[PDB]
mmCIF file of N, CA and C and ligand atoms in Angstrom:
data_model
loop_
_atom_site.group_PDB
_atom_site.id
_atom_site.type_symbol
_atom_site.label_atom_id
_atom_site.label_comp_id
_atom_site.label_asym_id
_atom_site.label_seq_id
_atom_site.Cartn_x
_atom_site.Cartn_y
_atom_site.Cartn_z
ATOM 1 N N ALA A 1 22.687 -1.127 -18.878
ATOM 2 C CA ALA A 1 21.943 0.049 -19.329
ATOM 3 C C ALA A 1 20.674 0.272 -18.498
ATOM 4 N N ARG A 2 20.329 1.543 -18.293
ATOM 5 C CA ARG A 2 19.063 1.941 -17.682
ATOM 6 C C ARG A 2 17.972 1.791 -18.731
ATOM 7 N N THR A 3 17.160 0.743 -18.620
ATOM 8 C CA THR A 3 16.119 0.476 -19.604
ATOM 9 C C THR A 3 14.709 0.750 -19.103
ATOM 10 N N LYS A 4 14.500 0.856 -17.795
ATOM 11 C CA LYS A 4 13.204 1.240 -17.254
ATOM 12 C C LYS A 4 13.402 2.357 -16.244
ATOM 13 N N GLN A 5 12.484 3.309 -16.240
ATOM 14 C CA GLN A 5 12.440 4.302 -15.180
ATOM 15 C C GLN A 5 11.758 3.671 -13.977
ATOM 16 N N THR A 6 12.368 3.812 -12.813
ATOM 17 C CA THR A 6 11.889 3.110 -11.635
ATOM 18 C C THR A 6 11.679 4.046 -10.452
ATOM 19 N N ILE A 7 11.830 5.340 -10.655
ATOM 20 C CA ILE A 7 11.544 6.325 -9.626
ATOM 21 C C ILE A 7 10.075 6.714 -9.731
ATOM 22 N N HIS A 8 9.419 6.870 -8.576
ATOM 23 C CA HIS A 8 8.012 7.252 -8.500
ATOM 24 C C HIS A 8 7.910 8.668 -7.939
ATOM 25 N N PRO A 9 7.872 9.691 -8.801
ATOM 26 C CA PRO A 9 7.898 11.085 -8.331
ATOM 27 C C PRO A 9 6.818 11.372 -7.306
ATOM 28 N N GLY A 10 7.206 12.084 -6.250
ATOM 29 C CA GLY A 10 6.284 12.494 -5.208
ATOM 30 C C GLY A 10 5.875 11.420 -4.220
ATOM 31 N N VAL A 11 6.456 10.224 -4.265
ATOM 32 C CA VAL A 11 5.962 9.108 -3.458
ATOM 33 C C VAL A 11 7.000 8.721 -2.418
ATOM 34 N N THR A 12 6.588 8.771 -1.158
ATOM 35 C CA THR A 12 7.409 8.420 -0.013
ATOM 36 C C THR A 12 6.944 7.080 0.529
ATOM 37 N N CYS A 13 7.894 6.205 0.854
ATOM 38 C CA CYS A 13 7.557 4.987 1.575
ATOM 39 C C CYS A 13 7.166 5.333 3.000
ATOM 40 N N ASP A 14 5.982 4.881 3.416
ATOM 41 C CA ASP A 14 5.519 5.153 4.771
ATOM 42 C C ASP A 14 6.210 4.275 5.797
ATOM 43 N N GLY A 15 6.859 3.201 5.353
ATOM 44 C CA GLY A 15 7.547 2.301 6.253
ATOM 45 C C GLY A 15 8.972 2.719 6.550
ATOM 46 N N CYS A 16 9.677 3.273 5.567
ATOM 47 C CA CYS A 16 11.080 3.613 5.763
ATOM 48 C C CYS A 16 11.449 5.027 5.328
ATOM 49 N N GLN A 17 10.490 5.825 4.861
ATOM 50 C CA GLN A 17 10.699 7.209 4.442
ATOM 51 C C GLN A 17 11.639 7.324 3.251
ATOM 52 N N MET A 18 11.817 6.240 2.501
ATOM 53 C CA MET A 18 12.430 6.340 1.190
ATOM 54 C C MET A 18 11.694 7.374 0.338
ATOM 55 N N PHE A 19 12.456 8.288 -0.248
ATOM 56 C CA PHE A 19 11.880 9.300 -1.125
ATOM 57 C C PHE A 19 12.873 9.860 -2.135
ATOM 58 N N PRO A 20 12.546 9.733 -3.425
ATOM 59 C CA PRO A 20 11.300 9.068 -3.825
ATOM 60 C C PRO A 20 11.477 7.564 -3.845
ATOM 61 N N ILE A 21 10.372 6.808 -3.868
ATOM 62 C CA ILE A 21 10.468 5.354 -3.955
ATOM 63 C C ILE A 21 11.090 4.959 -5.282
ATOM 64 N N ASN A 22 12.104 4.101 -5.216
ATOM 65 C CA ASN A 22 12.748 3.540 -6.392
ATOM 66 C C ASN A 22 12.435 2.057 -6.474
ATOM 67 N N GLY A 23 11.963 1.621 -7.630
ATOM 68 C CA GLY A 23 11.518 0.255 -7.798
ATOM 69 C C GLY A 23 10.015 0.149 -7.693
ATOM 70 N N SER A 24 9.549 -1.053 -7.374
ATOM 71 C CA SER A 24 8.112 -1.256 -7.324
ATOM 72 C C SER A 24 7.493 -0.417 -6.214
ATOM 73 N N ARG A 25 6.364 0.198 -6.528
ATOM 74 C CA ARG A 25 5.556 0.907 -5.552
ATOM 75 C C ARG A 25 4.354 0.046 -5.168
ATOM 76 N N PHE A 26 4.158 -0.151 -3.876
ATOM 77 C CA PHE A 26 2.984 -0.855 -3.371
ATOM 78 C C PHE A 26 2.081 0.161 -2.681
ATOM 79 N N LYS A 27 0.974 0.516 -3.333
ATOM 80 C CA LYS A 27 0.009 1.449 -2.758
ATOM 81 C C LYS A 27 -1.096 0.681 -2.059
ATOM 82 N N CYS A 28 -1.423 1.084 -0.841
ATOM 83 C CA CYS A 28 -2.558 0.447 -0.193
ATOM 84 C C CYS A 28 -3.830 0.780 -0.949
ATOM 85 N N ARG A 29 -4.651 -0.242 -1.174
ATOM 86 C CA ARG A 29 -5.927 -0.081 -1.854
ATOM 87 C C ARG A 29 -7.050 0.323 -0.905
ATOM 88 N N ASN A 30 -6.804 0.312 0.404
ATOM 89 C CA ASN A 30 -7.772 0.708 1.425
ATOM 90 C C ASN A 30 -7.440 2.030 2.098
ATOM 91 N N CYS A 31 -6.183 2.267 2.467
ATOM 92 C CA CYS A 31 -5.797 3.579 2.964
ATOM 93 C C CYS A 31 -5.879 4.601 1.846
ATOM 94 N N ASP A 32 -6.110 5.852 2.225
ATOM 95 C CA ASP A 32 -6.188 6.891 1.202
ATOM 96 C C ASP A 32 -4.851 7.115 0.513
ATOM 97 N N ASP A 33 -3.758 7.134 1.269
ATOM 98 C CA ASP A 33 -2.475 7.672 0.793
ATOM 99 C C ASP A 33 -1.324 6.987 1.535
ATOM 100 N N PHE A 34 -1.223 5.659 1.399
ATOM 101 C CA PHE A 34 -0.220 4.849 2.094
ATOM 102 C C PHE A 34 0.531 4.001 1.072
ATOM 103 N N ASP A 35 1.866 4.046 1.114
ATOM 104 C CA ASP A 35 2.699 3.363 0.132
ATOM 105 C C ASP A 35 3.874 2.664 0.810
ATOM 106 N N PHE A 36 4.280 1.539 0.226
ATOM 107 C CA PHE A 36 5.458 0.790 0.628
ATOM 108 C C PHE A 36 6.417 0.652 -0.542
ATOM 109 N N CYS A 37 7.702 0.813 -0.263
ATOM 110 C CA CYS A 37 8.700 0.278 -1.167
ATOM 111 C C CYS A 37 8.655 -1.250 -1.102
ATOM 112 N N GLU A 38 9.382 -1.916 -2.001
ATOM 113 C CA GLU A 38 9.241 -3.372 -2.036
ATOM 114 C C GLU A 38 9.774 -4.007 -0.762
ATOM 115 N N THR A 39 10.928 -3.543 -0.291
ATOM 116 C CA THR A 39 11.486 -4.111 0.926
ATOM 117 C C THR A 39 10.496 -3.990 2.077
ATOM 118 N N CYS A 40 9.848 -2.829 2.216
ATOM 119 C CA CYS A 40 8.877 -2.673 3.293
ATOM 120 C C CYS A 40 7.644 -3.542 3.057
ATOM 121 N N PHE A 41 7.191 -3.662 1.813
ATOM 122 C CA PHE A 41 6.010 -4.483 1.581
ATOM 123 C C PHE A 41 6.268 -5.936 1.961
ATOM 124 N N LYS A 42 7.490 -6.427 1.735
ATOM 125 C CA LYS A 42 7.807 -7.804 2.084
ATOM 126 C C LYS A 42 8.163 -7.962 3.553
ATOM 127 N N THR A 43 8.461 -6.862 4.239
ATOM 128 C CA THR A 43 9.096 -6.821 5.551
ATOM 129 C C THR A 43 8.194 -6.312 6.676
ATOM 130 N N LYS A 44 7.294 -5.373 6.410
ATOM 131 C CA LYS A 44 6.540 -4.713 7.463
ATOM 132 C C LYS A 44 5.077 -5.105 7.382
ATOM 133 N N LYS A 45 4.454 -5.297 8.545
ATOM 134 C CA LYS A 45 3.026 -5.576 8.580
ATOM 135 C C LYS A 45 2.236 -4.275 8.485
ATOM 136 N N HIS A 46 1.062 -4.361 7.866
ATOM 137 C CA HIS A 46 0.195 -3.198 7.732
ATOM 138 C C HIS A 46 -1.137 -3.579 8.362
ATOM 139 N N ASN A 47 -2.246 -3.347 7.699
ATOM 140 C CA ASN A 47 -3.525 -3.766 8.245
ATOM 141 C C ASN A 47 -3.895 -5.071 7.562
ATOM 142 N N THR A 48 -4.121 -6.108 8.366
ATOM 143 C CA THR A 48 -4.307 -7.439 7.812
ATOM 144 C C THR A 48 -5.485 -7.484 6.845
ATOM 145 N N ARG A 49 -6.467 -6.607 7.015
ATOM 146 C CA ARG A 49 -7.578 -6.522 6.076
ATOM 147 C C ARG A 49 -7.280 -5.621 4.877
ATOM 148 N N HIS A 50 -6.085 -5.053 4.795
ATOM 149 C CA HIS A 50 -5.759 -4.152 3.702
ATOM 150 C C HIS A 50 -4.929 -4.888 2.660
ATOM 151 N N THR A 51 -5.082 -4.485 1.404
ATOM 152 C CA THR A 51 -4.375 -5.120 0.304
ATOM 153 C C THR A 51 -3.698 -4.047 -0.533
ATOM 154 N N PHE A 52 -2.541 -4.397 -1.088
ATOM 155 C CA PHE A 52 -1.706 -3.479 -1.836
ATOM 156 C C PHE A 52 -1.757 -3.803 -3.321
ATOM 157 N N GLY A 53 -1.778 -2.751 -4.134
ATOM 158 C CA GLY A 53 -1.631 -2.873 -5.568
ATOM 159 C C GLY A 53 -0.212 -2.488 -5.937
ATOM 160 N N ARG A 54 0.365 -3.251 -6.861
ATOM 161 C CA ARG A 54 1.729 -3.045 -7.322
ATOM 162 C C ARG A 54 1.734 -2.075 -8.496
ATOM 163 N N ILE A 55 2.692 -1.150 -8.488
ATOM 164 C CA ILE A 55 2.854 -0.147 -9.539
ATOM 165 C C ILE A 55 4.332 -0.143 -9.930
ATOM 166 N N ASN A 56 4.656 -0.741 -11.074
ATOM 167 C CA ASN A 56 6.050 -0.863 -11.494
ATOM 168 C C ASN A 56 6.449 0.110 -12.609
HETATM 169 ZN ZN1 ZN B 101 10.269 1.336 2.600
HETATM 170 ZN ZN1 ZN B 102 -3.855 0.437 4.324
#
């Protein structure tokens, strides 16, 4: 059964252009408007001084 909504309306992964992001959203806390899907957050490097907040 579908028990949680996991689509993030209006949110594109900047790493892979997933749209909309399905699953956990990782928003950069330093960039104004930068987001990763989970695969990209675990897979792609960003700015080493930047940190992501998880939005599930
Ligand atoms: Zn992605
Ligand atoms: Zn950033």
